[PDB]
């Protein structure tokens, strides 16, 4: 009971982990053990996925979120995203699961056996939350680590087999990236793009050269920034702007993770380059477009002139104009005209969908893709009944895009809440009123009346 | 020697883990039977003969879909007593005819009477004013208007709510399609009383928790309160300044505050009960006549009101054949209202 | 002092009748703009082509609505998620036709309400209060984000945002039930437990404290004169209240600690409403309520309907009728 009850720590059992704020040794244990839980899940979930996996069904009919991540990196797949070799999946699973034992070992050791505080044992590993230079130094180490991680993605893409490229000419395939985009006008340009429709900020990234190029930039930015924080101490304007405490630094990081979570939600819902539809299923926009393409194809085969077919409203039944003139599909999918995907682009010319190309050049593979995507739109029930809410039981399907978007919206939201909880708390505790108002120095009693 | 009545009174009013009282004699059996009847029916009893539905765990339903369903429409408003002229003492037939519906509804009603008598009985013994009983009149008005008056105005008990999670959802959606109940201003006042009540609950709990006096050294602040302490545990003055500056007005009287917390959700439920008394009679806020005159004469005039009526028309046509099996409706595909494509 | 310092002291002054603050400098202009645009639109905006099919819906009072039917109508489906400020339109006439006021209102409102929440943290800091009133407000705020922003993002259009009006709200609700089976979604069910339970505990707490007010007034005066603003002593006997409620249920079902009680009053609705906000924000990406349609089957394979099947029939009626000229193909995929 060195701080292990409410009487001595000041924290109840339900706020038990707050007993660790000034116990750097046990807190290192907490962290390392936790890192082990993450790595454990990556490893075990992968093996579970692989055990359940039938390589000839699409991944997206099988409730896989991890295999799709491995495949996107170029491992285990060939043209069209066909699975050629499951062993790289097995390796990723096993190596995480083994590594998790090591992290788990270190965590348990530091939490229950090693020294509770580190400051007596080591001036390098010990830390005071108020030591601005030590905090920026540890930050700096972690920056360098993250930088190296980003450069590993570059290394995979450029020197160790490449990445799955859904846009590869002649059809999706693994491709080595030799000319990554380095021009800062392109890379930083993405950051100044509007997040609204037809723009989509960084979510719009639509080619692997930009993706790889962007990670070269982030790799170097993080390594540089890390060196910077090792060699420097916060400037005075930073000193006056922030609160300097463990709970405050937690809050900043909670806000950042909430943001990233919302971003990730949008990425998987709309982006079909770094979340290839071959592995994750069609996007919501995609499947709605694919429906319009399906019936255009069908009805044109029956003899319809799809260009001149006026629908009930007076707008074109199959084809119409966007508000800036481009030719787009009609019906409700008018909203989704910013969609772009490799099955559809061959039909697009400088004015939008090209009617000559529609009439003469639609290949059987485009009909197949469109029918597939129309019938695996990311709609389904919580018990995994695929389709619209009035659908009967039969098809066991919820898109990986839905599972991934929903989960991450939920987590980003509660992380925003945590940011406010901890940021408000850190401010109050730094100023000395987190446990309540001093009855004999109640500030409002020294203020003039409002009226 | 004191009298037997007084001796029974002593024993009924002994301080025990579960207070009993004279109210207990009505409350306990009626509550226990309502609850046991619901657990029995949802676990074991069908609705095949009354509705043509499966409704029990035995038949394969889950917690969301089980129910004790209302009796068939041909039963009218029969009490459906076990020994009555429909079941004639046959427990099995009684179950099949929906006898557990009336069993649960009537024992539940008498049990709610017993619960509010309990609230008065305990208040009197402990020496407090009976506002909790008074607040409970809202749940009573709701139960009575919805489970009793509403079906009594209609053809039969069949159109009461059935006791189940999905069944109640069905009751909501029926009310939208047939009664346009969202349009009804007595419902609207109910919504304001319920959401306003939930708002008051959240804002008041949060305000007290964030204007607490520091009365302890703990970072966990719950221990720094003693039930017998004479002093306010939070600052009303500071709370008042905060809300005055944030929202423009604030409570300054704690007695008014707590009274208002009773008033808002109790009044809202009472308003909703009055609307459902109207619906017993199909006396709905279904339409705005002026809207209909315009829309009929002017085929380019559209509002969200006219849109919702198209939804209601869809609900009635598509649900009625299966939801009202005694009507023997057959609606050929060609007569069903549908928009384009769907 | 210098002008900036004086300005900062005025912005953050604890003595202004209404607190301004740095969140306030963004809140004030954005809420004024949303308010002014809303009021004028609700009175006088012409009809808006919400579903992008050249079928404009009348929302305003002057164009044939009343208070119950009126609305500011969402922006055209032809726009989708595109940003449609006033300066993107060729004229105010176009802007009105295509539902520009909706986007101006909702974007300024969500920004302003977000700053309202920050302003609550801010004033609490200046007054030396604990900081978490703003956390309670995050519940209704999240709900507003869900129906005005996150649902549109998921479905690909602001035309699927909740309309700014009474009957429009009911329209949004009915279509949502058709497309998501929200009633069968456990997060909406948590929401109902949150608001029904918030109402219940609201009435319970009001009634218990009122039951136990200390006698301080005569029969010809409101008991409310028995409490004086700022008095140090509690105005009710919590031990009498707990004595009552503990007997009503049983002793350990009742709170004798006011701090614990008040935390519960905060938590129960806030949490349930966080779940219902998340119901709307996850159905935004079409993870929908439970579907037990045709779940119960007899020995031959005949479908035995349950109350879930009857819900399904109602949902179908909503589905086939909604936006009756807008669908050309057989599935409503967004």
């Amino acid at each position: 009971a060195t701080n292990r009850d409410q009487e001595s720590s000041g924290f109840a059992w339900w706020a038990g982990n707050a007993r660790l704020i000034n116990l750097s040794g046990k807190l290192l244990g907490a962290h390392v053990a936790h890192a082990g839980l993450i790595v454990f899940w990556a490893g075990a979930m992968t093996l579970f996925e692989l055990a359940h996996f039938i390589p000839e069904k699409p991944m997206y009919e099988q409730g896989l979120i991890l295999i799709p991540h491995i495949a996107t990196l170029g491992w285990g797949v060939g043209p069209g995203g066909e699975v050629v070799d499951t062993f790289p999946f097995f390796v990723v699973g096993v190596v995480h699961l083994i590594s998790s034992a090591v992290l788990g070992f270190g965590g348990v050791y530091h939490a229950i056996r090693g020294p509770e505080t580190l400051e007596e044992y080591s001036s390098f590993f010990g830390y005071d939350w108020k030591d601005k230079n030590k905090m920026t130094t540890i930050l700096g180490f972690h920056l360098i680590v993250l930088g190296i991680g980003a450069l590993l993605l570059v290394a995979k893409a450029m020197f160790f087999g490449g990445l799955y490229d859904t846009w590869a000419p002649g059809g999706g395939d693994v491709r080595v990236i030799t000319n990554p985009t380095l021009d800062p006008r392109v890379i930083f340009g993405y950051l100044l793009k509007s997040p609204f429709g037809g723009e989509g900020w960084i979510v719009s990234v639509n080619n692997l050269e930009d993706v790889v190029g962007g990670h070269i930039w982030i790799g170097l930015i993080c390594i540089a920034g890390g060196i910077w924080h090792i060699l420097t101490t916060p400037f005075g304007w930073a000193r006056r702007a922030f609160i300097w405490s463990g709970e405050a630094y937690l809050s900043y990081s909670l806000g950042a993770l909430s943001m990233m979570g919302f971003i990730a939600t949008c990425f998987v819902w709309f982006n079909n380059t770094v979340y290839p539809s071959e592995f994750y299923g069609p996007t919501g926009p995609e499947a709605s477009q694919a429906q319009a393409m399906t019936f255009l194809i069908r009805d044109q085969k029956l003899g319809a002139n799809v260009g001149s077919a006026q629908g009930p409203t007076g707008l074109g039944k199959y084809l119409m104009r966007s508000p800036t003139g481009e030719i787009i599909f009609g019906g409700e999918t008018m909203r989704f005209w910013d969609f772009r995907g490799p099955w559809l682009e061959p039909l697009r010319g400088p004015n939008g969908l090209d009617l000559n190309k529609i009439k003469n050049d639609i290949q059987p593979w485009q009909e197949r893709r469109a029918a597939e995507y129309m019938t695996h739109a990311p709609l389904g029930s919580l018990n995994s009944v695929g389709g619209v809410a009035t659908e009967i039981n039969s098809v066991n399907f919820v898109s990986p895009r839905s599972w991934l978007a929903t989960s991450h919206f939920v987590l980003a939201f509660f992380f925003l809440v945590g940011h406010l909880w901890h940021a408000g708390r850190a401010r109050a505790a730094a100023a000395g009123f987190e446990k309540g108002i001093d009855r004999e120095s109640e500030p409002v009693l020294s203020m003039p009346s409002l009226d | 020697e004191r009298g037997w009545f007084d001796i029974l009174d002593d024993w009924l009013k002994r301080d025990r883990f579960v207070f009993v009282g004279w109210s207990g004699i009505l409350l306990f059996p009626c509550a226990y039977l309502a609850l046991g009847g619901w657990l029995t029916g949802t676990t074991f009893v069908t609705s095949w003969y009354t509705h043509g539905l499966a409704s029990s765990y035995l038949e394969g339903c889950n917690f969301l879909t089980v129910a004790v369903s209302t009796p068939a429409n041909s039963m009218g408003h029969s009490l459906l007593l076990l020994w009555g002229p429909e079941a004639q003492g046959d427990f099995t037939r009684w179950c099949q005819l929906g006898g557990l519906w009336t069993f649960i509804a009537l024992h539940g009603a008498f049990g709610l009477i017993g619960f509010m008598l309990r609230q008065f009985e305990i208040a009197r013994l402990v020496g407090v004013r009976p506002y909790n009983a008074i607040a409970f009149s809202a749940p009573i008005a709701v139960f009575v208007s919805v489970f009793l008056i509403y079906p009594l105005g209609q053809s039969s008990w069949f159109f009461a709510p059935s006791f189940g999670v999905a069944a109640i959802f069905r009751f909501l959606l029926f009310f939208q399609g047939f009664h346009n109940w969202t349009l009804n201003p007595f419902h609207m006042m109910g919504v304001a009383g319920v959401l306003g009540g939930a708002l008051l609950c959240a804002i008041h709990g949060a305000t007290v928790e964030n204007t607490l006096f520091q009365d302890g050294e703990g970072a966990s602040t719950f221990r720094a309160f003693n039930p017998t302490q004479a002093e306010e545990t939070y600052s009303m003055v500071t709370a008042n300044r905060f809300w005055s500056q944030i929202f423009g007005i604030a409570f300054s009287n704690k007695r008014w505050l707590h009274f208002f917390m009773l008033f808002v959700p109790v009044t809202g439920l009472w308003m909703s009960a009055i609307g459902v008394v109207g619906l017993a009679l199909n006396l709905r806020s279904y339409d705005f006549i002026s809207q209909e005159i315009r829309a009929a004469e002017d085929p380019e005039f559209e509002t969200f009101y006219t849109k919702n009526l198209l939804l209601n028309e869809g609900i009635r046509a598509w649900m009625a054949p299966q939801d009202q099996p005694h009507e023997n409706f057959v609606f050929p595909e060609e007569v069903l209202p549908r928009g384009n494509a769907l | 002092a210098n002008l900036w310092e004086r300005f900062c002291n005025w912005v953050t002054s604890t003595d202004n009748r209404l607190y301004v603050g740095w969140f306030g400098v963004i809140m004030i202009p954005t809420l004024l703009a949303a308010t002014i645009c809303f009021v004028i639109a609700f009175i006088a905006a012409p009809p808006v082509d919400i579903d992008g099919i050249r079928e404009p819906v009348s929302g305003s009072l002057l164009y044939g609505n009343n208070i119950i039917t009126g609305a500011v109508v969402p922006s055209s489906n032809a726009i989708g998620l595109h940003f449609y400020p006033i300066w993107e339109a060729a004229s105010l006439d176009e802007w009105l036709y295509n539902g520009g006021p909706y986007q101006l209102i909702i974007f300024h409102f969500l920004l302003g309400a977000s700053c309202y929440m920050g302003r609550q943290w801010e004033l609490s800091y200046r007054l030396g209060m604990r900081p978490w009133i703003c956390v309670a407000y995050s519940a209704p705020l999240a709900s507003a984000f869900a129906v005005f922003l996150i649902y549109p993002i998921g479905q690909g259009s602001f035309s699927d945002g909740m309309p700014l009006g009474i009957s429009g709200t009911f329209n949004f609700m009915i279509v949502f039930q058709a497309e998501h089976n929200i009633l069968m979604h456990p997060f909406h069910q948590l929401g109902v437990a949150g608001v029904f339970g918030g109402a219940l505990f609201c009435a319970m707490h009001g009634s218990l404290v009122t039951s136990s007010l200390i006698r301080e007034t005569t029969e010809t005066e409101s008991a409310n004169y028995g409490y004086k603003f700022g008095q140090e002593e509690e105005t009710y006997n919590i031990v009498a209240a707990h004595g009552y409620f503990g007997r009503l249920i049983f002793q350990y079902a009742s709170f004798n600690n006011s701090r614990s009680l008040h935390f519960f009053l905060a938590a129960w609705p806030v949490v349930g409403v966080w779940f219902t906000a998340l119901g709307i924000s996850t159905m935004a990406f079409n993870l929908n309520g439970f579907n037990f349609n045709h779940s119960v089957i007899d020995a031959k394979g005949n479908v035995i309907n349950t109350w879930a099947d009857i819900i399904n029939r109602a949902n179908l009626g909503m589905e086939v009728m909604h936006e009756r000229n807008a669908h050309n193909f057989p599935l409503d995929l967004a």
Binding site: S449, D451 | V237, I249 | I43, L61, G230
Partner: peptide, 30 residues
């Protein structure tokens, strides 16, 4: 007539807000 009536009631409510805020009965601590 109807539009004037609905706008008039609204305008009265906005006026009531102004008086209820700025011409309130001041909270008095004593």
């Amino acid at each position: 007539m109807e539009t004037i009536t609905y706008v008039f009631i609204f305008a009265c409510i906005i006026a009531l807000f102004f008086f209820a805020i700025f011409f309130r009965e001041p909270p008095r601590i004593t």
